[PDB]
Amino acid sequence: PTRPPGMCHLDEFQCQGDGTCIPNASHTCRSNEFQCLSPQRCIPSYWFCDGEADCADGSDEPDTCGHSVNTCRASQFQCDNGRCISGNWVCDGDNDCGDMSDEDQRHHCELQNCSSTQFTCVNSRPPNRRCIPQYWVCDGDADCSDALDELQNCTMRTCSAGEFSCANGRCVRQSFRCDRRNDCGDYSDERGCSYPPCHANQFTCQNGRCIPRFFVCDEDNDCGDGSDEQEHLCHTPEPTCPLHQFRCDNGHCIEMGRVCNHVDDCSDNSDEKGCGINECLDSSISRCDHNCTDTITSFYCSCLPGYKLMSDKRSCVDIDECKESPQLCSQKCENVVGSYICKCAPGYIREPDGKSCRQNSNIEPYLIFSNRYYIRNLTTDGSSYSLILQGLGNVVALDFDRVEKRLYWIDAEKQIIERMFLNKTNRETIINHRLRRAESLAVDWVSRKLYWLDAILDCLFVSDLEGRHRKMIAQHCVDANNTFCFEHPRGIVLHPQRGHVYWADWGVHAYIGRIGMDGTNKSVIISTKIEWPNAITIDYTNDLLYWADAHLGYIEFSDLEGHHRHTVYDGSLPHPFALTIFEDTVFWTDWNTRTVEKGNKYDGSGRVVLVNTTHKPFDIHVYHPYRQPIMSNPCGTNNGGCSHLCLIKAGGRGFTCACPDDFQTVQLRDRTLCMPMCSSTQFLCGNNEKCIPIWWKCDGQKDCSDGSDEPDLCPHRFCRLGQFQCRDGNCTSPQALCNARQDCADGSDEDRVLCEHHRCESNEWQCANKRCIPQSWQCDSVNDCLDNSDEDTSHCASRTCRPGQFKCNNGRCIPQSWKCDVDNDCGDYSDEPIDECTTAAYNCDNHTEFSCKTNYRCIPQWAVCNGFDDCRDNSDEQGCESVPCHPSGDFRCANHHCIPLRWKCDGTDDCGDNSDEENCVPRECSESEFRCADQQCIPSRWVCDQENDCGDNSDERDCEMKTCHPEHFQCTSGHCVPKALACDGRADCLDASDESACPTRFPNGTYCPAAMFECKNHVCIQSFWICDGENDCVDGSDEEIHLCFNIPCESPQRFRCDNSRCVYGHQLCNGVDDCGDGSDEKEEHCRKP
Amino acid sequence: XXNXX
Amino acid sequence: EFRMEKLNQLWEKAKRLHLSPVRLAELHSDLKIQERDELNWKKLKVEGLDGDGEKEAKLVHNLNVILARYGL
Ligand SMILES: *[C@@H]1O[C@H](CO)[C@@H](O[C@@H]2O[C@H](CO)[C@@H](O[C@@H]3O[C@H](CO[C@H]4O[C@H](CO)[C@@H](O)[C@H](O)[C@@H]4O)[C@@H](O)[C@H](O[C@H]4O[C@H](CO)[C@@H](O)[C@H](O)[C@@H]4O)[C@@H]3O)[C@H](O)[C@H]2NC(C)=O)[C@H](O)[C@H]1NC(C)=O
Ligand SMILES: *[C@@H]1O[C@H](CO)[C@@H](O[C@@H]2O[C@H](CO)[C@@H](O[C@@H]3O[C@H](CO[C@H]4O[C@H](CO)[C@@H](O)[C@H](O)[C@@H]4O)[C@@H](O)[C@H](O[C@H]4O[C@H](CO)[C@@H](O)[C@H](O)[C@@H]4O)[C@@H]3O)[C@H](O)[C@H]2NC(C)=O)[C@H](O)[C@H]1NC(C)=O
Ligand SMILES: *[C@@H]1O[C@H](CO)[C@@H](O[C@@H]2O[C@H](CO)[C@@H](O[C@@H]3O[C@H](CO[C@H]4O[C@H](CO)[C@@H](O)[C@H](O)[C@@H]4O)[C@@H](O)[C@H](O[C@H]4O[C@H](CO)[C@@H](O)[C@H](O)[C@@H]4O)[C@@H]3O)[C@H](O)[C@H]2NC(C)=O)[C@H](O)[C@H]1NC(C)=O
Ligand SMILES: *[C@@H]1O[C@H](CO)[C@@H](O)[C@H](O[C@@H]2O[C@H](CO)[C@@H](O[C@@H]3O[C@H](CO)[C@@H](O)[C@H](O)[C@@H]3O)[C@H](O)[C@H]2NC(C)=O)[C@H]1NC(C)=O
Ligand SMILES: *[C@@H]1O[C@H](CO)[C@@H](O[C@@H]2O[C@H](CO)[C@@H](O)[C@H](O[C@@H]3O[C@H](CO)[C@@H](O)[C@H](O)[C@@H]3O)[C@H]2NC(C)=O)[C@H](O)[C@H]1NC(C)=O
Ligand SMILES: *[C@@H]1O[C@H](CO)[C@@H](O[C@@H]2O[C@H](CO)[C@@H](O[C@@H]3O[C@H](CO)[C@@H](O)[C@H](O)[C@@H]3O)[C@H](O)[C@H]2NC(C)=O)[C@H](O)[C@H]1NC(C)=O
Ligand SMILES: *[C@@H]1O[C@H](CO)[C@@H](O[C@@H]2O[C@H](CO)[C@@H](O[C@@H]3O[C@H](CO)[C@@H](O)[C@H](O)[C@@H]3O)[C@H](O)[C@H]2NC(C)=O)[C@H](O)[C@H]1NC(C)=O
Ligand SMILES: *[C@@H]1O[C@H](CO)[C@@H](O)[C@H](O)[C@H]1NC(C)=O
Ligand SMILES: *[C@@H]1O[C@H](CO)[C@@H](O)[C@H](O)[C@H]1NC(C)=O
Ligand SMILES: *[C@H]1O[C@H](CO)[C@H](O)[C@H](O)[C@H]1NC(C)=O
Ligand SMILES: *[C@H]1O[C@H](CO)[C@H](O)[C@H](O)[C@H]1NC(C)=O
Ligand SMILES: *[C@H]1O[C@H](CO)[C@H](O)[C@H](O)[C@H]1NC(C)=O
Ligand SMILES: [Ca+2]
Ligand SMILES: [Ca+2]
Ligand SMILES: [Ca+2]
Ligand SMILES: [Ca+2]
Ligand SMILES: [Ca+2]
Ligand SMILES: [Ca+2]
Ligand SMILES: [Ca+2]
Ligand SMILES: [Ca+2]
Ligand SMILES: [Ca+2]
Ligand SMILES: [Ca+2]
């Protein structure tokens, strides 16, 4: 029994000062008429005070007009004072009410009919007419934007010399094409038009419109996008009269002498409506609970500090300092009326300043971070810098477990997940199957689970800490609009107290999402002002969510729900990738500079660089007991009773049983029955632990936990691990399984008993025949199923596009962002409706995207200056020397293109003019790299591997003078090969040193199975490779003449010489004596057969 | 690109 | 140019046909005159001031002939 490090027992309270634990004559003119005071003129009724002198009358408008003394009634429906209408007035577009308020084109509209004497083109919205006379039908020119006019059962001709062929089979003169107008209804004349740029007299909208300057701020949307009526384009700054002046009600500035001088200098009495009455002293209108101040002419209230003023300008409200300004108190903050209290989380002591929280533990934190080949051991102050592991492929992410001191990491090259104790013992692999592309992982120290994100499958996974019971938790999209979906999931953090999982995505619609650890409550947290969120983490003592952005260059934090986003670094970071929090400090890694930085977590002050790195640092964690806070496991014992995964409920109060992927979650009231439901291409373990792929069955290693994977009576394993074995012993790749093509020589790979219940991956769709294809290949106008079941017209008409995607008219499904991007992604232009794309609903995000000049395409700002035609206008590359590169992380090429510094001297051209790879000094090879003669750095694992990696065999020298890693087998020539390939029956050393000393594999002396010829040097080759002219085994026994007598000759492939050897056809008449007898060069075969 | 691991 | 709904529709055709500008200008002139008459006619419809069909025929007569002099 112990008191937890720096903490107190659960039955005690902790004094925050030190940390000590304590116990808890009208000429007959009167019929509807009045007099004009003239002997010949008569005012008709209602026309007096109409606003116009309609008659020469002196009683018309002598300021006797009452606007709304008597108003119109429902007998003539009212729309404005003195103006009322009915009938078809209410929606016709005529100026009825004097201001078109008679309809406003809103009320009682959107319901119409058209007579039979006309033709109703109903497919037109009220701005376009929907009824044209029958004479207009096929009169010669169209009148509806629907444009069925000229195509309603009417003929055509074979075009004209000066006309353009529209897609609707009609021709029109070429002067109308590329003019930004629908001259044949379907915009066919507008497809592929490189519109000219706008001139000085023309304002340019978001979409290419080239509108003249008159309509700018004319309060009418003329661009279609509202670009001509932007709020900040029509910006009217407030005239303030700052110095000893005064701001009149009408906007005038007058000098101080012109205030309270009994003269209206402002023409609105703003300087004289006062001067002697003190409303603050009125003590009745002041109503200020706090103090008041009566200026020259009027009063105002003013709140005491800790209180905020609001709309009423009289009252005060307590500021919620712990939410409005969390920067005040490190760690927990408690709001009070008019003030606040800072409290340190348990385990931290409150320094007397009231704002510093110091860790009470005696354990000193350090940073574990990963490079390409290395996991490294760096203290928080940067003083000590050592290596934890080396020789790893690509450590893209890692995490640690406090409970039993294990380190977990993802090797993105081998696509495996490993774990190891922090004393560098018991290194083992837990996940080595599927795992197309894992990017970020997090270890659940509470419920003893592992979570990770897959980028290719676009999924969130969960697994046990030993790797068993893999389950797919989240997929597809996260919001109800289906706007934000799994595109490039990167960065993951857990909050077991609330039972949530947080992750970020740098796809086109970048967001930060939250989900329950059982998958129930997926939602969007941050979705605005975010482009490349590569980093995410939580401060557990503050319930603050920290994330970074590689494009906008900021580090920002907000509450757990996503409100109150406070910026720490105002976009000055080149390219952060991962970050972590401890006490009051942010640690993060930059890719452009390849450095690990450090700074204050609330304002970024004290920024210092901890260390360089020759490779990009990916993942960083502060290893300390405080970074994984102690709480009680909801699945107390027996996994809460579940036979499979016990997962924490959202909110962190309950728990939920769940089953692995290939299982059915059959629900009862007492139990969730996990009934295995694996496909016919999988093998089920006897104890129902898991269903493994069928090619793992009887492969020589125990894949099943109970040992049922390797029963006694299954045939000798010919193939390697991870290869499928046909019934006759020949070998095929697993992808050959049920691909509708005969790979096995006997068709073992396509048996109905194997492929009848075959199931495809989550990112692939199954054809009519069981072949699996990627889902993006369906309805793509190419036969991919070999029976055209992916391109079936009925299937394409009935299918539904994946969430977050958009379906074309021809059944093609494309990403949502590809819609309205001035590109024919659908082939039939169904994704580019000009009337809809040119609307404000498809604007470019001012914060992050750039708008092309002559069209409506939006591109991300990081595509500018890149050297590519991102806008089809080529308008994102013009004059791009004006933009400045980043002050510290960007190297500028000679052609004014900015590139990240990490690409400088990387060995490849990234500018185009090769200015980055010039004046270049070769870099220093790191700890586990080996340096070639030409100063190139290669992994040390590549030395003496029988491959010319440097380019001149500089890494292949003096191999027999050295040993190698213990997992390898050293050949006679000194080269090293993995141990598993040694004593396996095939020559893997080029000298065949392996298999040259292994004992008999059988008792009757035979080294190889009877089906295969065994060479005298104890290697096995397949019997049809014999006598083929190739030394398939180094002893030459597979080409010896005498033992080659027992073979026929295949005339369409081989031809017999004077020697019984039957060389391949291309050696006949080749000019080289191949058989050694000149029979291949007998010239009678080099003529016409 | 510039952000792919 | 015109308040009238269906006269705006007719007026667009003559621009598309590129008729004689002087006759085109005169075409706007009488249509502007007619729209006042047309609104006056259907002002009577809400006022109930005609039941003999005069104020409809007089306007469609000119319009029908305008269809001939301008192809409409
Ligand atoms: C690197 O760091 C790791 C983690 O700290 C070390 O691993 C631990 O090593 C210790 C010492 O061997 C282990 O402690 C012993 O475990 C025995 C069995 O534990 C069971 O339960 C644990 C927890 O679930 C399981 O991990 C484990 O598999 C077993 O199921 C206990 O029976 C031992 O206690 C008994 O015997 C000792 C004397 O041997 C008595 O003093 C005790 O009173 C008691 O009678 C003991 O506790 C521990 O299990 C290991 N943990 C893990 C996770 O494996 C590595 O050893 C360390 N490497 C080096 C080289 O230092
Ligand atoms: C897939 O894996 C197998 C095994 O690794 C590879 O080699 C096959 O192995 C068998 C077993 O030796 C071969 O069978 C032998 O083939 C000889 C020629 O075969 C042709 O002619 C016979 C008729 O004479 C046909 O049945 C056959 O389909 C071919 O058209 C036969 O002459 C041999 O028969 C002699 O021995 C047997 C006993 O072994 C006696 O019963 C006979 O009386 C006779 O004495 C023998 O049948 C087989 O030919 C190999 N190939 C094939 C295609 O199976 C395969 O090469 C590999 N897949 C491929 C295509 O590479
Ligand atoms: C030294 O020792 C080794 C190991 O014991 C021997 O190798 C075995 O040799 C025997 C006899 O030739 C082989 O048995 C025969 O295999 C044929 C092909 O194998 C297929 O079928 C088996 C059994 O289902 C599968 O395991 C395998 O994957 C193949 O799909 C069979 O067709 C033969 O059956 C025929 O003969 C038997 C009687 O022998 C009849 O009952 C059948 O009806 C049928 O007519 C037979 O099973 C065996 O495959 C070899 N095993 C290995 C591991 O190589 C060497 O022969 C022995 N001698 C020397 C000096 O090397
Ligand atoms: C306006 O702002 C002034 C300061 O510029 C405040 O003085 C005033 O509120 C007053 O605050 C003072 C100081 O807190 C209070 O004075 C009390 O005096 C007692 C001895 O005479 C002493 O024992 C108390 O601790 C206080 O110091 C005072 O009560 C308080 N209120 C008033 C009505 O003066 C601000 N005025 C308001 C109402 O917002
Ligand atoms: C990351 O770096 C730090 C600093 O280099 C490492 O801390 C020290 O590492 C050494 C060598 O691994 C440990 O021995 C030290 O802890 C030990 O603790 C026991 C028990 O008190 C003592 O008997 C030992 O004499 C020693 O002090 C350790 N020191 C501290 C204060 O942490 C850290 O281990 C390293 N992490 C990894 C994963 O290697
Ligand atoms: C997808 O997200 C958008 C934006 O958040 C949601 O659009 C919003 O939906 C409401 C109700 O449909 C819209 O009200 C409607 O606006 C139009 C145009 O002004 C008007 O003609 C209708 O009478 C109605 O008032 C609202 O404008 C719109 N925008 C916002 C920000 O509220 C939408 O609900 C989400 N889901 C769907 C189904 O698209
Ligand atoms: C499941 O997910 C939803 C959406 O992410 C969560 O809803 C949000 O929950 C927070 C915290 O309860 C709410 O904040 C609160 O809002 C209320 C007003 O509605 C306010 O009075 C509180 O002081 C607090 O600010 C937030 O409004 C709410 N949003 C919505 C639209 O639901 C929900 O809490 C999650 N539930 C679980 C099990 O985690
Ligand atoms: C990192 O590299 C730069 C440039 O070589 C160097 O000036 C700086 O001192 C390095 N940082 C450290 C901590 O050595
Ligand atoms: C648009 O950009 C401006 C700065 O020019 C910014 O202040 C404003 O917040 C942005 N608006 C939107 C919609 O993001
Ligand atoms: C297509 O999507 C709809 C919803 O939009 C249904 O979910 C339907 O089941 C989907 N079809 C397939 C093939 O799953
Ligand atoms: C042989 O070389 C390998 C190269 O990784 C190791 O350095 C190994 O320790 C060496 N063996 C001996 C005995 O020095
Ligand atoms: C061959 O190896 C086996 C084991 O695989 C036995 O050791 C046997 O004694 C060896 N020799 C012979 C003649 O089979
Ligand atoms: Ca009047
Ligand atoms: Ca109207
Ligand atoms: Ca027509
Ligand atoms: Ca056009
Ligand atoms: Ca405008
Ligand atoms: Ca004055
Ligand atoms: Ca407060
Ligand atoms: Ca993806
Ligand atoms: Ca984006
Ligand atoms: Ca950047």
Ligand SMILES: [Ca+2]
């Ligand atoms: Ca196996």
Ligand SMILES: [Ca+2]
């Ligand atoms: Ca196949």
Ligand SMILES: [Ca+2]
């Ligand atoms: Ca296809």
Ligand SMILES: [Ca+2]
């Ligand atoms: Ca498109």
Ligand SMILES: [Ca+2]
């Ligand atoms: Ca570009």
Ligand SMILES: [Ca+2]
């Ligand atoms: Ca370069």
Ligand SMILES: [Ca+2]
């Ligand atoms: Ca090599």
Ligand SMILES: [Ca+2]
């Ligand atoms: Ca071998």
Ligand SMILES: [Ca+2]
């Ligand atoms: Ca050979």
Ligand SMILES: [Ca+2]
């Ligand atoms: Ca030859």
